[PDB]
Amino acid sequence: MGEIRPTIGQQMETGDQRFGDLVFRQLAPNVWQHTSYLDMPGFGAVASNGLIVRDGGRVLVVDTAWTDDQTAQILNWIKQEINLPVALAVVTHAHQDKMGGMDALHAAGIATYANALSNQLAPQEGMVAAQHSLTFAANGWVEPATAPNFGPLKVFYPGPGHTSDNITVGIDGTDIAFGGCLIKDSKAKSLGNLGDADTEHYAASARAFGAAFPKASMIVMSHSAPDSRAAITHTARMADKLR
Amino acid sequence: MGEIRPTIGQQMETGDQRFGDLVFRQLAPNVWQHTSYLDMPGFGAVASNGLIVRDGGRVLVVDTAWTDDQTAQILNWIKQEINLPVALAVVTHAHQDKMGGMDALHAAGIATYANALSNQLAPQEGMVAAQHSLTFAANGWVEPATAPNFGPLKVFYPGPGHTSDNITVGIDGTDIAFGGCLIKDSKAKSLGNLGDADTEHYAASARAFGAAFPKASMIVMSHSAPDSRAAITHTARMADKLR
Numbered sequence: 001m002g003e004i005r006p007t008i009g010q011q012m013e014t015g016d017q018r019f020g021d022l023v024f025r026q027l028a029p030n031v032w033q034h035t036s037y038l039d040m041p042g043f044g045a046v047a048s049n050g051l052i053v054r055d056g057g058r059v060l061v062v063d064t065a066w067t068d069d070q071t072a073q074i075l076n077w078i079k080q081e082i083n084l085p086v087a088l089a090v091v092t093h094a095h096q097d098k099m100g101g102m103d104a105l106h107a108a109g110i111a112t113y114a115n116a117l118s119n120q121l122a123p124q125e126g127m128v129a130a131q132h133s134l135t136f137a138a139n140g141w142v143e144p145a146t147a148p149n150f151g152p153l154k155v156f157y158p159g160p161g162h163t164s165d166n167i168t169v170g171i172d173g174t175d176i177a178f179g180g181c182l183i184k185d186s187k188a189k190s191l192g193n194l195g196d197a198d199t200e201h202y203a204a205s206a207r208a209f210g211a212a213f214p215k216a217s218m219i220v221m222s223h224s225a226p227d228s229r230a231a232i233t234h235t236a237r238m239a240d241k242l243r
Numbered sequence: 244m245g246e247i248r249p250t251i252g253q254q255m256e257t258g259d260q261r262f263g264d265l266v267f268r269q270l271a272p273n274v275w276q277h278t279s280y281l282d283m284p285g286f287g288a289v290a291s292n293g294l295i296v297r298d299g300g301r302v303l304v305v306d307t308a309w310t311d312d313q314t315a316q317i318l319n320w321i322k323q324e325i326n327l328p329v330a331l332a333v334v335t336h337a338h339q340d341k342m343g344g345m346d347a348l349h350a351a352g353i354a355t356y357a358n359a360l361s362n363q364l365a366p367q368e369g370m371v372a373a374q375h376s377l378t379f380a381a382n383g384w385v386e387p388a389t390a391p392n393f394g395p396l397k398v399f400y401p402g403p404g405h406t407s408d409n410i411t412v413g414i415d416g417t418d419i420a421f422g423g424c425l426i427k428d429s430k431a432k433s434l435g436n437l438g439d440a441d442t443e444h445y446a447a448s449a450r451a452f453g454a455a456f457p458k459a460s461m462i463v464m465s466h467s468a469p470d471s472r473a474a475i476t477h478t479a480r481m482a483d484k485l486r
């Protein structure tokens with residue numbers, strides 16, 4: 001009873017934990033997926049997924065929820081279920097699904113990180129910029145000095161795709177990588193919103209993500225349930241059709 | 244060059260005809276799918292599909308476009324490219340994607356038909372009601388006296404599903420059946436907007452549609468490309484998980 005059934009996004013499944021207006025799903029002993037819903041009048045809810053990672057003695061969050069209130073709820077769930085400090089949050093680009101609740105993280109005193117470009121785009125996108133800017137080498141790997149204390153979070157800029165600023169994250173010592181809005185599931189009919197997409201480079205960016213995290217057998221993404229690596233292949237092949 | 248790439252909906256394929264803001268795809272010698280697009284700010288375009296059917300010296304339309312202007316463009320295209328008059332339109336329920344262009348039909352002097360219930364709901368939905376009401380037998384088939392001169396349009400009310408009023412249409416003399424917004428594609432991760440849905444009866448209504456048109460191999464639907472019968476059965480499996 002009382003199930004959120006989104007118009008866009010995966011439906012609730014056995015194992016999912018309802019907490020307020022959000023859903024949490026444990027993916028590994030120290031990794032959970034957060035799911036928040038934006039209700040659009042006349043259309044219904046759009047689900048958006050991120051990650052919560054317990055690494056040693058702290059929690060690391062990948063992506064905010066759509067709103068400040070939802071993101072405050074994520075922090076309350078973390079406090080309740082895990083009860084370790086949230087050391088940092090990383091956001092995967094400057095769109096509402098990934099960065100809409102930044103004020104809730106800052107209110108909580110949590111150090112926030114995004115691609116420098118995401119921070120530069122934030123004002124234009126109506127997002128609040130993160131505190132800190134990540135920069136990247138020519139091979140796409142984050143410059144370690146800009147990602148202090150990230151631990152198992154390996155951050156990779158795969159090239160422009162869904163947006164110019166999109167980044168991805170692998171979780172060292174797990175079989176999980178996070179593709180955000182760049183990677184769609186292996187059964188997806190479309191690449192979602194292409195309004196900011198780099199149609200020429202998307203395919204290579206998708207394949208670069210797969211090459212960056214060869215250990216990841218569980219691919220987590222923003223608007224589908226976790227999938228196999230066929231998500232990457234299928235995303236790239238869809239993207240091949242754009243060029 | 245200059246393709247519409249919707250966020251929700253089929254992509255452009257070889258053979259598609261771009262005409263202003265619309266796309267037409269021939270599905271059979273005497274059947275075309277019309278596609279119109281609604282821009283959702285921040286989300287991108289949402290495709291909606293209906294049908295154009297040639298029956299001898301006249302054309303029959305299933306569903307309006309999202310808007311009056313788009314719907315006027317469909318009528319221009321029928322007039323200019325098919326060169327036959329529209330005898331009537333049948334609209335498949337009282338939402339914008341299916342009925343948002345009613346006034347353009349009426350201004351063109353075209354007789355319109357909808358489920359009586361659709362006409363009753365239309366003003367509550369800000370839609371213009373069709374000029375004529377269809378009624379249905381206890382087994383779902385349209386009452387012939389309410390659908391005069393429908394030629395090959397075989398109208399079936401499958402039961403409440405996507406909405407209480409949703410209707411479906413088979414094309415006699417073809418292997419095509421139209422499920423409107425009731426049926427989702429064979430690989431859909433969701434049933435779309437369930438806000439007005441009858442979650443108890445959806446699965447049986449989807450199966451009723453399949454059973455009404457048991458030989459139809461091409462299943463046309465509102466927001467994806469024409470699919471196999473697995474669209475019907477997958478839709479019913481997804482609906483089974485609502486109950």
Ligand SMILES: CC1(C)S[C@H]([C@H](NC(=O)[C@H](N)c2ccccc2)C(=O)O)N[C@H]1C(=O)O
Pocket residue numbers: 008038040046095096097098181191192193194222223250283284285286
């Ligand atoms: C799910 C989307 C089609 S919408 C989302 C993003 N858009 C937003 O966060 C918008 N603020 C939004 C507006 C209206 C409804 C939903 C989202 C984008 O444009 O990439 N990510 C897209 C995607 O991941 O393909």
Ligand SMILES: CC1(C)S[C@H]([C@H](NC(=O)[C@H](N)c2ccccc2)C(=O)O)N[C@H]1C(=O)O
Pocket residue numbers: 007040041042043281283289338339340341424434435436437465466
């Ligand atoms: C594509 C949709 C998810 S939206 C559409 C319909 N919604 C409308 O026509 C609304 N007027 C609308 C409002 C905002 C944005 C888009 C559509 C509905 O509620 O069934 N059909 C839905 C569906 O077929 O599942």
Ligand SMILES: [Cl-]
Pocket residue numbers: 001002003
């Ligand atoms: Cl319920």
Ligand SMILES: [Zn+2]
Pocket residue numbers: 093094095162163181
């Ligand atoms: Zn985005």
Ligand SMILES: [Zn+2]
Pocket residue numbers: 097181222223
């Ligand atoms: Zn997204």
Ligand SMILES: [Zn+2]
Pocket residue numbers: 336337338405406424
């Ligand atoms: Zn509808």
Ligand SMILES: [Zn+2]
Pocket residue numbers: 340424465466
């Ligand atoms: Zn629809």
